[model samples]
Target chain A: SFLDKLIETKELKNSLYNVLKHNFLYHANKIAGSTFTTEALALLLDKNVVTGRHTLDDVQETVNSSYVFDTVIDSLKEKITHNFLRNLHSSLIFNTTQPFEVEPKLDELIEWYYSQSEVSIKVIAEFHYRFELIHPFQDGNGRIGRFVMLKQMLENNLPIKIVSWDSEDLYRNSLNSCSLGNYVPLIEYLSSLEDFREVYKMLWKLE
Target chain B: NSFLDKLIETKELKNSLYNVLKHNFLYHANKIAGSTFTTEALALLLDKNVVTGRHTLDDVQETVNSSYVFDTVIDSLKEKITHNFLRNLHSSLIFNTTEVEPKLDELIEWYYSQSEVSIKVIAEFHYRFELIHPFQDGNGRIGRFVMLKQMLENNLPIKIVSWDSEDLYRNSLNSCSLGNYVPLIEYLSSLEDFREVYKMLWK
Candidate 1:
């Protein structure tokens, strides 16, 4: 009832849509170690910045561009490789060095990713950890990794669980430990999210 | 011209180099290894060294034993260390059921008591750390991270010890269990190509 009433206002509807899009782009960029002014991102959405149409001058401009935003739902028909990851990073940030170290590991991950059973919250969390571990692209590793996690979840019919930016310190700490030899804290952190299915359904116009 | 100026210049240079190398490594390491090597993983490795130095053995245990570090069930490790009867027998036959804590404590003491901070000392520490192989998983990653930390603490510059050929590194570590440490020592001492990497990066 509250959500229904909240979506009724004309101004609220547009602002809500903008905020949702901005938050997805904004937090993803922030987590990946990109710095930007709120004003810049807000303006980019205000003007409806599309990726290929706009010339990206910096990481902020690049990430806020339409192409980067559109990639969240872009179909994945190509093989996921280190090169593919590098290309994804390049879209989010200009001039990233092409990936050269991750092909073998990327292959291994994809090889074992399929032929698996339940694609539950646990699988989603572990996949995020592994992708983050690969840290495929320079500068946008966090953003791209999170996006890939979201993509996998959607493909599996799992609900979208947005990573709140407030937990960044914990996020980094959790990621750090994941590399040393643990994935529990991050997994637990992900699994504990309150379902944001409404948020996704509203934004994607599914409802 | 002044000593103060020279020190400032060096510090600045070190900081600049660190940023460049970090970015370059993070950007390209996975591609370099043809795998998913995250900077977070590097930080985890480096932090393990810091933890070993500042925190007690229990702290190290908590970290290594945590489920995030490595696991076959979750992380999907390529090489799984099976905990079989022979493994238990090996631990029992060696030192009263392969007591991880005592061996860890002994290793830590040995690390501090060393009179010289040579390659030998670093090598010995690396060998002993692996010999314990305390954790059921991720012992190699932890061991390598510790080695990097020891090298840094010993005043060596940051060197990314390339396991370019896993066989060489694996063989060296494996040999240590048989009372032969020369292979491991030589391998450890020979990874001082940071300057070469540094040169390549600048070019």
Candidate 2:
């Protein structure tokens, strides 16, 4: 029993604390980032939409949710290149981040005017950090954000890599702290790794 | 040197590990020696009611599902009746008594049964233990860990799947949570072939 070990060693409280903090970041990142997976691919097919992980039975849940996403796209980028931000917000609250307030204007502030390169990554990370504070979806935003970066990486044709489960300090410090101008630590750490595909390959090969 | 670090470093250390492992098993066994349940107690525990002791494997299986609500059904069999369950259960706990207290008697029995150690036996053992799911938390954790341990023991090619890619681990877990075992089972089955591919890493 860890309880016995902890009492003997006195590390139990700290260990439990760390696990909870990491799990919260994990759920949010998964929910948000994965939203981009089908939708962005759907966009390339000219069928831009969002997919709901709510249940197996819901058909076209992706397209159904896109209407709400469309509203965020309109407000955020002025022209909704792909409803990216809107879906991110939706991932936060399950379905509630409707009317997507940050989706439209936040990009402008990050200096990533059209959601392109350097500024864009910053904006997206910030958007994710802020969204966690917003907690838009019902259950899975923390996990979603981490994958959202991969979707962006896919567009870049870069291999995706982000530390998972074990990288508690790195995750919380970068994403949860929501620091305003200095996302370099988070960006450098994540970008230093390969993009999503390589990471995906690792998953496939993992025992 | 710390025992584990030294174990793989030299032939002498390797021999020492065998003794260390033996001693550890005995220590655990002595802790549970006097209980009413013997090692093969799961079959009996699930079969024999407080009043009657005639329940068969079918009855145990069905009753476990019905009573523990799928949670216990999968756990107890794997942990107590089979091996790998306790090992899996240990990693899952972020802290002690976090979840699922297993029966000590059955756990020892299953652990001993598992000591035979071979790949075919391991693969078969993996399937049977998982079907049991002895502890309440992390069935797949046990399942996957068993795969790694079995591979290593058999000297078969195996490596940890990085789960580095997008959401595979999460979805894999979700599927198991809902009792949709196909994704994981297939993922696992692929390893037999995947190991062959792994040979490329060494070459």
Candidate 3:
């Protein structure tokens, strides 16, 4: 509940968790080819300042990135459905372009995701792998897929982690191997990323 | 009849020219034709006089001109069902355009030849205008402006062929070219109030 209040209250907003989130968002968006700097993103999040070479869509996507993270973090308690995933994709693509109907194919994908009832990080990577191939929305497929993977980790009582932008080369190499039906590298690569367990401990320790 | 009455006697009327509905109309109509102005950019440009995003002047021109076409529809209520009127509307929005105006005039005559203008009639008129496509560019936006005029004539709420429904709109328009207006009429009938249509996808 404090996290909710911490997330909501701008006046009482300084927290390590907030910094961690912004750090996650910065790299994730940069990986997606946005030109946002930490200062640009901070002004966007902290001051509502909209400057720099960032396109209106870049700014919109930055804000939507925060919304998507918020949605997924809370959605750990909920089930993923065609409607739910499509809702995430909508927020991810808002104030941008493209609205292809994602109901049917996405519904099929959700059915498959649900069947993976005995879930783990490897299965979550496989889920993320399959989601990229589905290409549900015209854009933001990468972020939503990553967000879902994060949510799945939480849902399974696993530690939270950001899929690192530094691992782009390994992610892609593993992802490519994944496409060939060998999910070993992808799964191993995912397991190699650091979890947020200490990030929480540090958040509690912060003033 | 109750539904028809609801068209005129709805909760309250929104000025389709100035409200969020207008931005949806401007955004999606231009969007289907490949313009890149987002709804947020449109609201900013139209409301704040500040152009948002990396959008081109041409894109902004199309939207501003589309809004002008909306005004033309409202002012031309007395004689919106015509040839020269639509050409003017087309001219307003499309900077580059031309005529196969003979067929356009013929289409106009065929339109008023009917006993009365109904929703089906509007769909047919809209479909036929698109097929003839008198202008070189911006035919879709202009056709919808004429359809908007017909909708107002019938006291219907300002609705749009939303971009989310782009496939339905495209398939129906394609069907109309094959001499069946049934799909389009149904599609048009399925439209929500512009704001409702805008919310339908985002939510």
Candidate 4:
């Protein structure tokens, strides 16, 4: 089991951490329309060599994603402020896939989110909805937003949940639904997202 | 490399795939619907129309029925799916069911009109037909044959994944009922690589 491997090796590599990190970026890249597969990410992280054909952009974004995820983990200390989000975007996204004075709008959204006394899935989902609406960065907003959502999820002690690529369309249409003041579809999606911790448990073969 | 083109241009490939489907689809489809027929019994029946081992009559009959439905689908592979062909398939798929032809006809109409991916259409098509629930029983079995027919008509591969896991089969159906066909289509497309089956044959 990976836990045994981790305990014996005293490090994250060749263990559950490595398995899940690869799965996280593989699916994340898939959703963002990159061709970097799970095996490719695994080998890339392991040997610094890609397993298959990859654009230079794909490799760099993958590395940036890995860096950004580590940033998220280390930054799980407080309410996600606007500057933190700005810095997160700088590292993870750029003014390139397709923004402006998005800062004021983003700060307001963060204010509204932190203003919530009892944050629910609806609040987190709405925060993402509001973030996408602002879309301050030119590209990779989804990745940065999801990771910020992950930070909030971990901060609140909620289970880590990643969207499965199969559910990508529903996630999108539901976001559209969110804009029209219908939150049930997105809420239900958020509520039922498979917890990454549980997924790793199962993937580790219950050893 | 063009499996579908060669399948169209060659007869030898047809027989090889047919025999494979005859065993796997027959056993797996009926097995999902609660059949007790073993693959061994199915192979024997496929070859000689008889089996020596003890097997239930209904299981044996369903196996024969599924094989016939497959044959009908294969025979009409080159043609557009017509209601006449579906009715014929239903007749053979059961060896046998009562009819509700118009609803099925309309569903087929919607199927042809859609510009979605082939497996996507098949997932929704099969799910919608199951909801029509024309027969008290045999809805699933017939619906799957139609799925097979449409896959062939579109030059798609067989959905040769194991439907042996009845849990996934039922759950995907439920997912379809919720206007989400991805779960089911995910199941249907699991065997997209033909070498998947090639590796299976080696095993």
Measured by TM-score, the strongest candidate is 3
Model 1, residue A73: distance off in Å is 1.0
Model 4, residue A7: C-alpha shift (Å): 13
For model 3, residues A1-207, the per-residue Cα lDDT tens digits are 434433454245665446656777886787787777777777666655554555546756887888888777666668887778779978888756333545666677678778875887777877788788778877787888877876787677665567666644666677777773667877888778776655566454344
Stretch of 10 with least lDDT, candidate 4 chain A: A1-10
The digit string of per-residue lDDT tens for model 2 on A1-207 reads 222221243234433322322232333333333222333323312322212222211212332333333233234324323355446545434422254754444444334534454435555565556545545445444544444443443333344354453325556665644466666666665665443334333223333
In CAPRI terms, where does candidate 3 land? incorrect
| Stretches of model 1 off by over 4 angstroms after superposition | A1-20, A37-40, A48-65, A76-83, A95-101, A179-181, A199-207, B1-203
**lDDT for each candidate structure:** 0.51, 0.38, 0.68, 0.67
- Model 1 local distance difference test score: 0.51
Over the stretch B1-203, how does candidate 3's per-residue lDDT look in tens digits? 33323333432345332354456667788788766667776667665554455444356456656776765665666474666776687678865221567877878888778788788878888887888767777788777777776766665656677888989998988877646899898898888775344433223
**lDDT for position B102 in model 1:** 74
Which of the predicted structures, 2 or 3, would earn the higher lDDT when compared with the native?
Answer: 3
DockQ of 4: 0.01
- Most DockQ-accurate candidate: 3
Tens digits of per-residue lDDT for model 1, B67-149: 12222121221222234421432332222111887777777776677785676777777787777878674455555545544
Badly placed stretches (over 4 Å) of model 3 are A1-11, A98-109, A205-207, B1-203
Worst 10 residues of 3 chain B by lDDT: B2-11
User: How many clashes (backbone atoms < 3 Å, residues ≥3 apart in a chain or on different chains) does model 3 have?
Assistant: 0
Give the per-prediction TM-score of chain B.
Answer: 0.53, 0.34, 0.78, 0.80
Writing each residue's lDDT as its tens digit, candidate 2 over B1-203 gives 23223323332332243223222222222112211222233223333322122222223222222222222222232233343545433443212111123444443455457656544444444544555666565454445445544554445444343333214433543455232455554444443333344333222
